[PDB]
Amino acid sequence: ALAQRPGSVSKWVRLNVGGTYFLTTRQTLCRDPKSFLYRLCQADPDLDSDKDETGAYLIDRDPTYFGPVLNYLRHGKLVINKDLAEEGVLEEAEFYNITSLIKLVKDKIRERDSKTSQVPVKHVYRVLQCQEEELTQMVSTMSDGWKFEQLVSIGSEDQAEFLCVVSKELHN
Amino acid sequence: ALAQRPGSVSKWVRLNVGGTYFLTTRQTLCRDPKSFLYRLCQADPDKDETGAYLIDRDPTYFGPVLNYLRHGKLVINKDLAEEGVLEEAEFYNITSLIKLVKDKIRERDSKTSQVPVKHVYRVLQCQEEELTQMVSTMSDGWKFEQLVSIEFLCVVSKELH
Amino acid sequence: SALAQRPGSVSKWVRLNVGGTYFLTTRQTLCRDPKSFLYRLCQADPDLDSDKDETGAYLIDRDPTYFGPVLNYLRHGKLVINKDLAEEGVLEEAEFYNITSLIKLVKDKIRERDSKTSQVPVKHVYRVLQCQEEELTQMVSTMSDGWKFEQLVSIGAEFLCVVSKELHN
Amino acid sequence: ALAQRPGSVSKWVRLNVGGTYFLTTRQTLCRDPKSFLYRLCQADPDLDSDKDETGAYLIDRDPTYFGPVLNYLRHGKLVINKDLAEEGVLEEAEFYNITSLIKLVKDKIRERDSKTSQVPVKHVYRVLQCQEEELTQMVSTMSDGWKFEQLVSIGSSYNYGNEQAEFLCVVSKELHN
Amino acid sequence: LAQRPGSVSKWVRLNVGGTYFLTTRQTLCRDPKSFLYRLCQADPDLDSDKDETGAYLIDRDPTYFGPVLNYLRHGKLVINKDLAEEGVLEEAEFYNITSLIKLVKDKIRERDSKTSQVPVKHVYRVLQCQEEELTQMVSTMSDGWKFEQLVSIGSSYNYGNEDQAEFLCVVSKELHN
């Protein structure tokens, strides 16, 4: 087997998922003994599950959502292309019963769900005040995050000459 | 049948939709006695010499249709146009599903189109000291607009969705 | 050598090899628009036999990526384009296969999504209202249909209230 | 001569690019006589290039980026799918060596490059001034592109000389290409 | 074909997890460190698992192979938009192509800092100016500054006088990389 060490032997297995052929090995299919695929892990002639004439095992499922599943079995990472529905993938995760994966999948969803849905950013407001002699400084030293909103005058020793409304963004 | 109990009913069917092969089972193709797919349902005699029934439809939109049959949830790829899935939902005549799609459509249409942000305004007033109090504890979604000195009038706003 | 037309040049099912991608429909579908060049297959026109592969598929030296939507129009009469798919490319096809009513529906899509996208400077319209202290609260709250409050001004009439409106063309 | 083979002097041609088949006519392969594709442009007597089981001209390139190339050769217009990367097209255009096309590509790249990142807009200002009465006249005639910034009441006076200017209006306008 | 008349050219088909790829032994020599290299020569007594159609079998996801094989073809890293580079990164590591894995991590880190980067800080200044010179002031602000607010400040009786100071003008400027 090209990829593996010379001298070794690999049991290639072909799956026909919903009409699309997938090539992989009995070895990759032992990853999860709780998955019904594990049935292939073990070599068995008196198991004869339905095959097509090329000998590929028949599965009645959408193949487009299968890749990410299979690939989880191959390298432990969940990887979904940007144009693909994770809902679809959650369904295959379940049908093939791979609890570790199902787990990750659900996280991928809430992770990108709390990202999507949220009403315009929340704003906080402060009111600053200063004597006139400290006006320049007050504004030129505006703290890191804040936005100037509005300057107001009072005035008539401690008299508060200028008010200043100032704002900030909240990101969550 | 690999994913099922040993010794089970399970007849495999191939569908050629618009020149794309789709494997499924008579079982999933009977979930609804109303579809035109229900004809394939119970084995009964247009196949290519690959034995696959021929269907004169676009296959890219069939995926979602076949999946509903498969599990009963409606799932659509982002890059995909729900009208496309609607059209097919009707062709094959899957009432329970035709319903679901018009939802997804109308759900994402209320999120799409709602006439420009209608703004509401109000003019709170307050005494000098409770000035901080006011602005500080401003209500859930309101923006500070302007502060006017008379003590003070504070104008505030909020959007409408 | 081709004494007569190819067998099943009149077959119900029809395969199209568009630039290297097979599409499967029925002769019927292709009889939708008599003015169209695809009608030729419908009318079993001898000419085509030059451009029919050996399996039987009709050869078309065009990009297939834009064909499906065209084909589907013929199938069910609605225009449907995938979100990532460029309409200009569909417009080129609609025109090549010369399907007038489609070409039409396509040009609508373009102008519809352009008037949406390319919003040109939102020119504005300002009005300076005047409201006494009292009728201060009412004036803003029940402001006119599409009018943003812009500023409130005072004068020891009591308040001038600038208000605005966005125009979109 | 021996037999009577049809399908010999044929107008159609199939290119197996990186393992995907592409269909076209020998003619389309004549747009740019500089491109090595031109070899198939005409029915070449003595040549004979490497084909596969199915008589397609094997090409060791990515087919996913070939589409635009071929289409250029078809109708002369460059058209790329929104999900595609022009770099990929750029690479192929060079391999097949189609100068006028390569030319079009680098335009598409730099064109959508000057769009992504560019320096924020420079505004411009103006201070209008007007009596109390001419207030509606001021707004009513604000020039085409100007936004209301702020309106200042001057608290108008009983002063000698300074007898002019009840309201000031700061106003603004962007600046573009 | 793509080669000048009378040239050595030995084709190979890779069946990557169910999908076929056409390439040449030539291409699979870019990195003598990758196992793909075992195909660099037309090894007579090799016998790596092939299928019916004599294509070498590989238990990996094809969808992320393109970018790899492409890098082998021309040496540039190319990915489409809808593809996760995390996926590409894996295969880059599986076939073991140092140079590639290198460039792929650049691509991720590049678009990580792009994705999530902090809002823009600002600078504020409060100028004061005579009623008269007020038009001048806003009219001639420097290249990067925005007008923020004007504050009438003197007193009806003083407005227009010289030891005055009639408005305070708040003014701001964005800061960029």
Examine the domain organization and report whether D127 and D114 are in the same domain.
no
Examine the domain organization and report whether E31 and E52 are in the same domain.
yes
Examine the domain organization and report whether A38 and A94 are in the same domain.
no
Q: How far is residue D59 from each of residues D17, E9, E21, E119, measured CA to CA in Å?
A: 5, 11, 11, 49
Q: Name chain D contacts of E74, Cβ cutoff 8 Å.
A: 91, 95
Q: Which residues touch B31 (CB under 8 Å, ≥6 apart)? A: B69, B72
Which one, of D138, D161, D157, lies nearest residue D148 by Cα?
Answer: D138
Instruction: Name which of D31, D66, D139 to mutate to probe chain C: the one with the most chain C Cβ atoms within 10 A of its Cβ.
Output: D139
Can you tell me the distance from the alpha carbon of D118 to that of D99, in angstroms, rounded to the nearest whole number?
A: 30
- The domain tally of chain A equals 3
The answer to whether D168 touches D131, Cβ cutoff 8 Å, is no
- Interface contact flag, C126 D145, Cβ < 8 Å: no
Q: How far is residue D81 from each of residues C12, C84, C87, D88, E81, measured CA to CA in Å?
A: 34, 7, 10, 12, 11
* H/E element, E21: strand E19-24
**Running DSSP on this structure, what letter comes out for residue A64?**
G
Exposed, middle or buried, E135 (CB in 10 Å: 0-12/13-18/19+)? middle
Strands in D147-153's sheet, in edge-to-edge order, are: D124-130, D167-173, D147-153
- Interface contact flag, D74 C63, Cβ < 8 Å: yes
End of a domain among D103, D121, D139? Answer: D121
Q: What angle do CA A137, A148, D126 make, to 5 degrees?
A: 100
- Interface contact flag, A28 E119, Cβ < 8 Å: no
Exposed, middle or buried, C168 (CB in 10 Å: 0-12/13-18/19+)? exposed
Can you tell me the distance from the alpha carbon of B41 to that of B53, in angstroms, rounded to the nearest whole number?
A: 12
By the CB < 8 Å criterion, does E146 face chain D?
yes
**Domain CATH code at residue A171:** 3.30.70.2000
| Alpha carbons within 13 A on the beta-carbon side of E27 | 22
Backbone φ and ψ for B17, nearest 5 degrees, come out as -95, 110
Strands in B20-25's sheet, in edge-to-edge order, are: B20-25, B12-17, B53-55
By the CB < 8 Å criterion, does B107 face chain A?
no
Q: How close does chain A come to B138, measured CA to CA in Å?
A: 8
The amino acid occupying position A42 is: Q
Q: Name chain E contacts of D159, Cβ cutoff 8 Å.
A: 156-157, 159-160
**Domain CATH code at residue B110:** 6.10.140.750
Examine the domain organization and report whether A90 and A44 are in the same domain.
no
Examine the domain organization and report whether A149 and A167 are in the same domain.
yes
Q: Name chain C contacts of B60, Cβ cutoff 8 Å.
A: 68, 82
Can you tell me the distance from the alpha carbon of B116 to that of A104, in angstroms, rounded to the nearest whole number?
A: 39
- Nearest CB to C86; choose among D14, D79, D136: D79
Q: Name chain C contacts of D154, Cβ cutoff 8 Å.
A: none
| Alpha carbons within 13 A on the beta-carbon side of B94 | 28
Q: How close does chain C come to B68, measured CA to CA in Å?
A: 20
Contact pairs from chain B to chain C, CB under 8 Å = 74
Listing DSSP states for D129-169 in one string gives EE-STTHHHHHTT--TTPEEEEEEE------SS----SEEE
- Nearest CB to C150; choose among D6, D77, D148: D148
Examine the domain organization and report whether B66 and B56 are in the same domain.
yes
Q: Which residues touch B134 (CB under 8 Å, ≥6 apart)? A: B124, B126, B154
* Ramachandran sector of residue E80 (left: φ over 0; alpha: ψ -120 to 50; beta: rest): beta
By the CB < 8 Å criterion, does D6 face chain C?
yes
Q: Name chain D contacts of E8, Cβ cutoff 8 Å.
A: none
Q: How far is CA A26 from the centre of its chain?
A: 29
Q: How far is CA A157 from the centre of its chain?
A: 60
User: Solved by what technique?
Assistant: X-ray
Residue of chain E whose Cα is closest to the Cα of A135: E126
Q: Name chain C contacts of B150, Cβ cutoff 8 Å.
A: 154
Examine the domain organization and report whether E18 and E83 are in the same domain.
no
Neighbours of B72 (CB within 10 A): 11
- Is the CA virtual torsion C6, C10, C12, C14 positive or negative? positive
Contact pairs from chain A to chain B, CB under 8 Å = 93
- Interface contact flag, E159 D154, Cβ < 8 Å: yes
Neighbours of E13 (CB within 10 A): 16
Examine the domain organization and report whether B36 and B5 are in the same domain.
yes
Examine the domain organization and report whether B106 and B76 are in the same domain.
yes
Can you tell me the distance from the alpha carbon of A53 to that of E43, in angstroms, rounded to the nearest whole number?
A: 32
By the CB < 8 Å criterion, does B158 face chain A?
no
Q: What angle do CA C84, C90, C96 make, to 5 degrees?
A: 160
The answer to whether A126 touches B137, Cβ cutoff 8 Å, is no
Listing DSSP states for B98-129 in one string gives HHHHHHHHHHHHHTT---S---EEEEEEE-ST
Which one, of B67, E65, E174, lies nearest residue A18 by Cα?
Answer: B67
Q: How close does chain E come to A48, measured CA to CA in Å?
A: 22
The amino acid occupying position A86 is: E
- Interface contact flag, C72 B58, Cβ < 8 Å: yes
- Interface contact flag, A23 E153, Cβ < 8 Å: no
Q: Hey, which bits of chain C come out as E strands?
A: 13-18, 21-26, 58-60, 127-131, 148-154, 159-164
- Interface contact flag, D81 C65, Cβ < 8 Å: yes
- Interface contact flag, E159 D158, Cβ < 8 Å: no
Q: Name chain B contacts of C146, Cβ cutoff 8 Å.
A: 116
Can you tell me the distance from the alpha carbon of A123 to that of A125, in angstroms, rounded to the nearest whole number?
A: 7
Q: How close does chain D come to C50, measured CA to CA in Å?
A: 9
Examine the domain organization and report whether E63 and E1 are in the same domain.
yes
The answer to whether C46 touches C53, Cβ cutoff 8 Å, is no
Can you tell me the distance from the alpha carbon of B58 to that of B88, in angstroms, rounded to the nearest whole number?
A: 8
> Across-strand partners of B23?
B14
Q: What angle do CA E137, E143, E149 make, to 5 degrees?
A: 45
Q: How close does chain D come to E73, measured CA to CA in Å?
A: 8
Question: What is the maximal distance between C-alpha atoms in chain A?
Answer: 101
* Residues in chain E followed by a break, C to N above 2.5 angstroms: none
By the CB < 8 Å criterion, does B157 face chain A?
no
Which one, of A131, A128, A160, lies nearest residue A142 by Cα?
Answer: A128
- Which segments of D7-151 does DSSP mark as H helices, in order? 38-41, 66-75, 86-95, 99-111, 113-116, 135-139
* H/E element, E57: strand E56-58
Question: What are the tokens at A103?
Answer: 């787990």
* H/E element, A106: helix A99-116
**Running DSSP on this structure, what letter comes out for residue C158?**
-
User: Subunits with at least 3 CB pairs below 8 A relative to chain C?
Assistant: B, D
**Domain CATH code at residue B44:** 3.30.710.10
Can you tell me the distance from the alpha carbon of E128 to that of E168, in angstroms, rounded to the nearest whole number?
A: 4
Q: Name chain E contacts of D125, Cβ cutoff 8 Å.
A: 138-139, 141, 147
Examine the domain organization and report whether B12 and B57 are in the same domain.
yes
Q: Name chain D contacts of C92, Cβ cutoff 8 Å.
A: 75, 77, 79
**Residue C128's domain spans which residues?**
123-169
Q: How far is residue C121 from each of residues C155, D114, D125, D148, measured CA to CA in Å?
A: 34, 21, 18, 15
| Alpha carbons within 13 A on the beta-carbon side of E151 | 23
Strands in C13-18's sheet, in edge-to-edge order, are: C21-26, C13-18, C58-60
The answer to whether C27 touches C34, Cβ cutoff 8 Å, is no
Which one, of A20, E60, D171, lies nearest residue B20 by Cα?
Answer: A20
The amino acid occupying position C32 is: R
- Nearest CB to D154; choose among E138, E141, E152: E152
> Across-strand partners of A126?
A166
Q: How far is residue E135 from each of residues B99, C138, E131, E144, measured CA to CA in Å?
A: 64, 36, 8, 18
- Nearest CB to B79; choose among C12, C72, C82: C82
User: Subunits with at least 3 CB pairs below 8 A relative to chain B?
Assistant: A, C
Instruction: Name which of C117, C125, C128 to mutate to probe chain D: the one with the most chain D Cβ atoms within 10 A of its Cβ.
Output: C128
Q: How close does chain A come to E112, measured CA to CA in Å?
A: 15
- Interface contact flag, E147 D170, Cβ < 8 Å: yes
Q: How far is residue A137 from each of residues C106, E116, E123, E142, measured CA to CA in Å?
A: 61, 32, 12, 21
Q: Hey, which bits of A66-161 come out as E strands?
A: 122-130, 147-153
- Nearest CB to C82; choose among B19, B80, B121: B80
| Size of chain D, expressed as the number of residues it contains | 177
Can you tell me the distance from the alpha carbon of D167 to that of B36, in angstroms, rounded to the nearest whole number?
A: 76
Interface list for E 47-106 with A (CB within 8 A): 48-49, 56-61, 63, 81-84, 86-87, 90, 94
* PDB resolution in Å: 3.1
Examine the domain organization and report whether D60 and D99 are in the same domain.
no
Can you tell me the distance from the alpha carbon of B126 to that of C154, in angstroms, rounded to the nearest whole number?
A: 16
Q: Name chain E contacts of D170, Cβ cutoff 8 Å.
A: 138, 147, 150
The answer to whether D119 touches E143, Cβ cutoff 8 Å, is no
End of a domain among E120, E137, E156? Answer: E120
The answer to whether C152 touches B155, Cβ cutoff 8 Å, is yes
Can you tell me the distance from the alpha carbon of B122 to that of B138, in angstroms, rounded to the nearest whole number?
A: 12
Q: How close does chain A come to E55, measured CA to CA in Å?
A: 11
The amino acid occupying position D94 is: E
* Ramachandran sector of residue A93 (left: φ over 0; alpha: ψ -120 to 50; beta: rest): alpha
